[PDB]
Amino acid sequence: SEAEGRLREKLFSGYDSSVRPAREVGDRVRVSVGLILAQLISLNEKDEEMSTKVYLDLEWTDYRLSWDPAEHDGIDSLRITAESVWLPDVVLLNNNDGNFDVALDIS
Amino acid sequence: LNEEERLIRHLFQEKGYNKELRPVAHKEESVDVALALTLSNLISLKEVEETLTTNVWIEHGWTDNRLKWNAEEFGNISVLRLPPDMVWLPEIVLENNNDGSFQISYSCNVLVYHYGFVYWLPPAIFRSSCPISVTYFPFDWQNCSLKFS
Amino acid sequence: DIVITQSPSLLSASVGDRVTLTCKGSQNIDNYLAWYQQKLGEAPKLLIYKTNSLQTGIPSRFSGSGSGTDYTLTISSLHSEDLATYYCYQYINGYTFGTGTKLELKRADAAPTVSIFPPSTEQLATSVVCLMNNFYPRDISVKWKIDGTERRDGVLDSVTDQDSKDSTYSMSSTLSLTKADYESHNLYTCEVVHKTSSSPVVKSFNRNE
Amino acid sequence: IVCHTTATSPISAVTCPPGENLCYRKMWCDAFCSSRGKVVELGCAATCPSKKPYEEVTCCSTDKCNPHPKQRP
Amino acid sequence: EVQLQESGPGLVQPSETLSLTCTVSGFSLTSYSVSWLRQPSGKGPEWMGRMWDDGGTVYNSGLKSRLSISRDTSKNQVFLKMNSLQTDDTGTYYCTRDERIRAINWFAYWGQGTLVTVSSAETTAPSVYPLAPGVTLGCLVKGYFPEPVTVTWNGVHTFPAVLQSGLYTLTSSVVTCNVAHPGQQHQRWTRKLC
Amino acid sequence: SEHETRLVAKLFKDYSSVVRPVEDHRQVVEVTVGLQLIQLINVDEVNQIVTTNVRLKQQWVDYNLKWNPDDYGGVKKIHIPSEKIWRPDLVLYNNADGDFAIVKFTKVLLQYTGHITWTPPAIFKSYCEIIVTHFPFDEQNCSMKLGTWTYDGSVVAINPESDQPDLSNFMESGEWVIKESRGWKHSVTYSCCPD
Ligand SMILES: *[C@@H]1O[C@H](CO)[C@@H](O[C@@H]2O[C@H](CO)[C@@H](O[C@@H]3O[C@H](CO[C@H]4O[C@H](CO[C@H]5O[C@H](CO)[C@@H](O)[C@H](O)[C@@H]5O)[C@@H](O)[C@H](O[C@H]5O[C@H](CO)[C@@H](O)[C@H](O)[C@@H]5O)[C@@H]4O)[C@@H](O)[C@H](O[C@H]4O[C@H](CO)[C@@H](O)[C@H](O)[C@@H]4O)[C@@H]3O)[C@H](O)[C@H]2NC(C)=O)[C@H](O)[C@H]1NC(C)=O
Ligand SMILES: *[C@@H]1O[C@H](CO)[C@@H](O)[C@H](O)[C@H]1NC(C)=O
């Protein structure tokens, strides 16, 4: 998949994943948060703790990750490992066990 | 001179292998991945926690045309064993796990064959959710499942 | 360190002969043995390393073989340019070099031109010299006898290399002794034996010119 | 008689010790039958070996009559 | 292309520091190590030490205290210093370029080698003397130092020099023999006693 | 110290941990394996799981890690991280719910001959067929099956260091007495592949 490799190399040329994608210095990144509940594992009344298996649904826009598909062999979407793009640090604030981040950083 | 080192240099340095790209001619193609599960041990079924613990081996199989080589050119080497970090992997996980261990336990070496077939048999210990039919206990039977995606 | 010995110490061969050299260690050298060629006054030249590998630009005449403790260098067809000294050495556990084997041209037997010169009158006023020219092979020995006993307590000896114009060797030895003892001794004799002869030969002088 | 044996590595043809004459081949599956096929055991015995329900056993008196499945008699 | 030239004082007295220089051509000292070999007269060679490409040094454990090695990459030279010399240090000294395979090293190219002689002796002229049977004829040189010595007659066969007490002697053969010695640019001719 | 730094640099400058450490790929890597039992931590009769603390000594020769001691001041052995070298991938086949392979990557001892000795600690939760008929006077024959996961016997050959496990460091259990121990090497041939 040579054209996909070339597009991917183009996008990340000079990309900094630690920097949020504000275009102007004052711009805000709007992030839509959804939640899909996969399994209510348990509720513990002694520990006042609810255990849930969920899928988050986070959506935003990063202007740095935009391209013209007609210039890149019609590639209309790209799947990228999450560690290499900027991710909002959305965490569960009221977690009880001290675990904030998601269980698996999928692409 | 060792033929395996020359073969690996040919495959990964010279040919410019990129592990982040699927082994397809065009993006529209889909990689056929073949799975089979070998059950090593049914460790336990905790009815109170509704948790099934199983030791299983997840045999993967797919074709990576980028890893083909002519055996006669490389000392008749017919199979090559590589760290899984080097090659593209389909990243198949236990979707209905109960504890958050989506991935395999041991990332064993990948076996690459000269005709491009890639064989992988990682062992894994899984704790899948298995809801319990209490009705006929102690004469009950249970219907657990493992869902891979 | 691993001790290394070579055999034979001298090898006589003729152009075109198959010739082979043996190098033998005291311990397992693990194929980490190399061969280099040396000529008189010339920079030594590496021929073989890792027991099998030709050095670049070396003629394919040379090939090495061996494993464990015993190794060989073989020349497929001896050329005149290949007459030289060959040293094996190992390099896994220290560096140790063999004594070297000298490769020399085979020749027909040549009898030594035995000659002797007396101590001159100047030597009396202040020793005999015994010379064995154009002999072959170099396997020879010489000694001094006088008054029915061994003589020349100060003697010395030397042998030349193969003279290319004749391929023969030449030897020279000194009947070195004290001038007072030379005057006291009534006579002295130089005698020598070799494969370059069928019988011993000797020459002598008395206590005067 | 001479039979193939799996006691040596690799399989080789060996004359039976005195008192044993029958060649046999035993094959059964294990966890690696997913790719490697059935396990193979070859040897010689004084009598046709017993068989577990999951073990195939064949017994024959001729020489070399118990080849590996990838080898011809 | 690849060449190494060894140079330095050929005659050195005991107890004073020997110094030798190796001049490298055809390669850069930053990519190839250079090693010094010693061959005592009448013995097989031995390894003394190596100038590594990284600029470090290593020495034979017996010679560790005596030897010092350094280089100048700007002029492709390698230097050797050695103190506390004795007569046993007489021999031929070679600098070599070393090949590598992983951590293993061996010698691939040799220099022409510089002879270093250690003796308490000092320059002297040959005491030329005649020899005659009373055809083969003889000529003698004694007590000259240092070598070489040049000899001519009026089929001439010359024999290698020998050391009687740390100074040289030589015999020659073929009436007058004419001898020259470079230690004092002298020349002389000796006629027979006949 | 400078000698050892130079040695370590020279060895790994162009080393590869992917290829097997043999001169020729048709050779077999001879790995010597020796299990040392430190403590019998637990026997779980209901789950049939035995927890033990062991040292899995492994020895093999790396053809590429030779050096000449006189080149480096007489340095005859060095310690290097095991993550950098090729290693046999021994896996506990009959693991119940523990780690399959070694996870504590201690340093190996590397000698000038290229001989590597690695003794990583591990906790093995081997599955055991517990027999409860004579409880509590029962004898349990629990076993540990160790083999290379991906390398086969034509590529890597493992040999037992000794006929029996090393119990010289064994901490005495307050509940069980080890009456007997023994190690056996099994070779199995499959109908796919005679060789
Ligand atoms: C507790 O439980 C454990 C299991 O969990 C159980 O362990 C068993 O213990 C018994 C003995 O107590 C074992 O039986 C032995 O197995 C040996 C296996 O050897 C293999 O290799 C043989 C060839 O190698 C020879 O040469 C090499 C080098 O030269 C050397 O390393 C080897 O040790 C050996 O000398 C091979 O012959 C052997 O054969 C097996 O497979 C072939 C074909 O596949 C088949 O024909 C055989 O029947 C056999 O299955 C095997 O591949 C074996 O060598 C050994 O042989 C001895 O006995 C036989 C007959 O009894 C004699 O012919 C022979 O001369 C020897 O004396 C013997 O068979 C068994 O394997 C263990 N099993 C396991 C899984 O570990 C404990 O016993 C239990 N303990 C209790 C209850 O107290
Ligand atoms: C590969 O095997 C064939 C025989 O199957 C043999 O002739 C050939 O030489 C082998 N190749 C190498 C490189 O050894």
Coordinates of C-alpha atoms and ligand atoms in Angstrom, one line a residue, chain D residues 6-7 24 40-42, chain F residues 141 143 180 184-187, ligand 1:
Chain D
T6 CA 11.4 -43.7 16.5
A7 CA 13.8 -44.5 19.4
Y24 CA 4.2 -51.8 14.4
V40 CA 4.0 -41.0 15.2
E41 CA 5.6 -43.9 17.1
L42 CA 7.6 -46.6 15.4
Chain F
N141 CA 3.1 -36.3 41.1
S143 CA 5.3 -31.9 36.8
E180 CA 11.4 -38.0 44.4
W184 CA 13.3 -36.4 31.2
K185 CA 13.9 -35.2 27.7
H186 CA 11.1 -36.1 25.2
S187 CA 11.4 -36.0 21.5
Ligands
LIG1 C1 5.3 -38.9 37.5 O1 4.7 -38.4 36.3 C2 5.7 -38.3 35.3 C3 5.1 -37.7 34.1 O2 4.5 -36.5 34.5 C4 6.4 -39.6 35.0 O3 7.4 -39.4 34.1 C5 7.7 -40.6 33.3 O4 8.7 -41.3 33.9 C6 9.0 -42.5 33.1 C7 10.1 -43.3 33.9 O5 9.8 -43.1 35.3 C8 9.5 -42.1 31.7 O6 9.8 -43.2 31.0 C9 11.1 -43.1 30.4 O7 11.0 -42.2 29.3 C10 12.3 -42.0 28.6 C11 12.0 -41.0 27.5 O8 13.1 -41.1 26.6 C12 12.8 -40.5 25.3 O9 13.9 -40.6 24.5 C13 14.4 -42.0 24.3 C14 15.7 -41.9 23.5 O10 16.6 -41.0 24.1 C15 17.6 -41.8 24.7 O11 18.9 -41.3 24.4 C16 19.1 -39.9 24.7 C17 20.5 -39.6 24.3 O12 21.1 -40.7 23.8 C18 18.8 -39.6 26.2 O13 18.7 -38.2 26.4 C19 17.5 -40.2 26.6 O14 17.3 -40.2 28.0 C20 17.4 -41.7 26.2 O15 18.4 -42.5 26.8 C21 13.3 -42.8 23.6 O16 13.7 -44.2 23.6 C22 12.1 -42.8 24.5 O17 11.0 -43.6 23.9 C23 9.7 -43.0 24.0 O18 9.2 -42.7 22.8 C24 9.3 -43.8 21.9 C25 8.9 -43.3 20.5 O19 8.3 -42.0 20.7 C26 8.6 -45.0 22.3 O20 9.0 -46.2 21.6 C27 8.9 -45.3 23.8 O21 7.9 -46.2 24.4 C28 8.8 -44.1 24.7 O22 7.5 -43.5 24.7 C29 11.7 -41.3 24.6 O23 11.5 -40.6 23.4 C30 12.8 -43.3 28.1 O24 14.1 -43.1 27.6 C31 12.9 -44.3 29.3 O25 13.3 -45.6 28.8 C32 13.6 -46.4 29.9 O26 12.7 -47.4 30.1 C33 12.4 -48.2 28.9 C34 11.3 -49.1 29.2 O27 10.8 -48.8 30.5 C35 13.7 -48.9 28.4 O28 13.5 -49.4 27.1 C36 14.9 -47.9 28.4 O29 16.1 -48.6 28.2 C37 15.0 -47.1 29.6 O30 15.3 -47.9 30.8 C38 11.6 -44.4 29.9 O31 10.6 -44.9 29.0 C39 8.4 -41.3 31.0 O32 8.8 -40.9 29.8 C40 8.1 -40.1 31.9 N1 7.1 -39.3 31.3 C41 7.0 -38.0 31.3 C42 5.8 -37.4 30.5 O33 7.8 -37.3 31.8 C43 6.9 -40.3 36.3 O34 7.4 -41.6 36.1 C44 5.8 -40.3 37.4 N2 6.4 -40.8 38.6 C45 5.8 -41.5 39.6 C46 4.4 -41.8 39.4 O35 6.4 -41.9 40.6

